[PDB]
Point group: D2
Chain length 233, copies 4
């Protein structure tokens, strides 16, 4: 399979596969069964912000998700990505729907990678997305251009979300995420998102992920699997 | 479609070169739209800085060594009317009958588009054996001393003739957009040109091309890995 | 006294001092009489953006001022700042009112300076606090109201007052040029909200560069924008 | 008196006041007696690099010090700087000598601060000039010799002197924390050259954060690194 490290914004509790009984943020290493989670007070139809950070000194992957004028949710997990990910990776955003549905709208996405061996750096910032965005690899139902936004999951003419949808956006360039002879390595990711649902049951969520360069949507990764994992193991 | 800043070490007066080593701005042709005398220093590490913005619509380059007057060239051009909106950016070099090392020690690029801000930045101060965010073309290699060698160097360390190589950044770049208020880019690279007995050739270029750009047939020597012909 | 280089957003035409007959953007070298101007379609009560750029290669100071979904105004002037300003300067924003009045609200301000010879300075304000210790506030300028920088006096009710001058300078001196320097560049960006009760807004906002010890010159209210002692 | 948070590169073991028995890197909160230390293989006459990081999410201050082609030294400490430092601070480098001596040469220094409630401050020195107006020099600190910052006294002949203290602070105050901030982070880097004539180099270099009005405390030469009034 693909090797995946994700921060998930999980809107639908699947207690079947280890989810808590509420909307949560999670850190996923090689599995959809989060190594650490925190309660998330998801606000239907409000624009939220996700900030992910990691460095080779603390070897600690941390995420904060927040809305304006509300307490933020925060999750951290000690992990050396040197022992998990290959040296060269792609970074992306993933989303899915199942029986239940939500818009998975990305309004902005920025990423910074620094590697001191002589510092090498990569930085991109999207505050709008265009009709033909050639520095993104779009996978599944993901599209760009509607209101200058990235729609990870299928939305009908009227703006209504559809079920059984999976989409991903990967940045075109591979990223040197770690190196054997490296003194300090760090990365930071930010994205803004709008999750809107018709009912009280939004599903299934958004993830920032890091994968092998040649990563694709695994067969039947709709719903609970977030476009990231082939199975629930 | 090519827009290049050339560091031209060999005068080819046949195709419009001045009679000295020069820096040049090339729009769609090897016959520079503007040039300036360049006091190229064999075996010293030099620096090139390229800048452009959609307000002044002026492409400028400065090339310098420590403790020496810099050489500077500028050209008014709207790149909105020249390049496609999505491009790749790279470094190119060549040798012909005459030869030089075309060593790149560092390379950075910044692009910004503010609409009515989107940004891309890369910085290489070192190059690795398997650099997956570069497309190497022709004789270009990475890993020797943590450097990018654009043209072929023998085991013994000697540069070879009839060599062409290029390095392109893997990701396409949004270089212009109609609905943009301000669009700008900046590129910097450090280079080491060393020639066996003097008489060096043929030079290094920073370029911007269509995404699918490759080394054109017979672009060794005077054509710098950039042009199919001398028109 | 002070050596001033400014980009002015001039809302009130003072044709007596060289001004065109419309709201304009201008480049001011050592004088309030703009060396180059352009018509500015100023929009009362909408948030606008100004972007100022300069580099030692082109030796050209350029400004663009725009609102969303409107054509931008642009002004440029060839000048070598090596021959005008000292090598160490302060950077700031200035605003004034006279008989006529407007809010001179700054919502954001960023500045970047690079000198290769690379030494660099960058600051970004997307909000201003009640006690902003990396700004020198001069005259009527205050911070804290809605996280904004009010360059000119505003009453409790939000109503602008006349005969007001205020400036905000960044605390640190900036190395703007150096004798043995290969490339020098700077960029400034600011967001502003100009609102007037009547059809006669005055007097405008300026991004400026001055000697480190620069202060509001006596009687630089109204047309002089808090920048100049006289109209020469 | 002054509130100090420091990363020390300590070249001289003062076991009397809690130092380990070897050259070490340390994190100092309000005291010279390091809250965490790590063995440092200090290399006389080689250019080294120091990298300091902190963010309000992990609330963990971390430092790495390295030379080319050598294993790095690393030290980390959980601390909420919200409960230690005032909201507004100055940042600097400090060094000292006592009976024993070393050059305390700074070749480069950069700092970045970001506060999302985004406000940002960034400086980079790869050169220091004769009259560097965005630095406050204190004690024996000077700039201009080889484009370097010499924190401690060096004689004409190039020889380091004992009983020397010097500091360099960035001129602008820094908003290091704010209550209603979602994420706050800072990063500092410097390159240094420590050279000693004998086998007893002393006393070391520190990156520090202090109250804005911070000065060299009375009798802070040698083991106290120009940072602390006493050894408590
Ligand atoms: C019946 O369950 C389906 O719908 C839920 C809610 O969308 C998903 O979590 C799950 O994977 C299935 O696709
Ligand atoms: C005789 O000319 C040859 O050599 C020069 C210098 O190398 C090149 O410019 C040219 O393309 C030819 O290959
Ligand atoms: C009558 O003119 C006054 O008012 C205008 C408009 O405010 C100013 O330009 C000028 O300096 C005076 O103060
Ligand atoms: C004998 O101790 C002296 O010298 C050492 C080493 O320089 C310092 O640590 C100390 O403060 C004293 O000045
Ligand atoms: Ca779930
Ligand atoms: Ca030629
Ligand atoms: Ca006027
Ligand atoms: Ca000690
Ligand atoms: Mn989950
Ligand atoms: Mn030529
Ligand atoms: Mn005017
Ligand atoms: Mn100690």
């Amino acid at each position: 399979a693909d090797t995946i490290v994700a921060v998930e914004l999980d809107t639908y509790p699947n207690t079947d596969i280890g989810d808590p009984s509420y909307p949560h943020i999670g850190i996923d290493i090689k599995s959809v069964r989060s190594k650490k989670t925190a309660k998330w007070n998801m606000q239907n139809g409000k624009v939220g912000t996700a900030h992910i950070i990691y460095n080779s000194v603390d070897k600690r992957l941390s995420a904060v998700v927040s809305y304006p004028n509300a307490d933020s949710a925060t999750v951290s997990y000690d992990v050396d990505l040197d022992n998990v990910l290959p040296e060269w990776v792609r970074v992306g955003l993933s989303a899915s729907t199942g029986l239940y549905k939500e818009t998975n709208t990305i309004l902005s996405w920025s990423f910074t990678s620094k590697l001191k061996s002589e510092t090498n750096a990569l930085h991109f910032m999207f505050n709008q997305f265009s009709k033909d965005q050639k520095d993104l690899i779009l996978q599944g139902d993901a599209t760009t251009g509607t209101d200058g936004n990235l729609e990870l999951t299928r939305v009908s003419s009227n703006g209504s979300p559809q079920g059984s949808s999976v989409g991903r956006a990967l940045f075109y360039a591979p990223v040197h995420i770690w190196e054997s002879s490296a003194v300090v390595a760090s990365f930071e990711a930010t994205f803004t998102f709008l999750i809107k649902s018709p009912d009280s049951h939004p599903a299934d969520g958004i993830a920032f992920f890091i994968s092998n360069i040649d990563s694709s949507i695994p067969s039947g990764s709709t719903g609970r699997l977030l476009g990231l994992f082939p199975d629930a193991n």
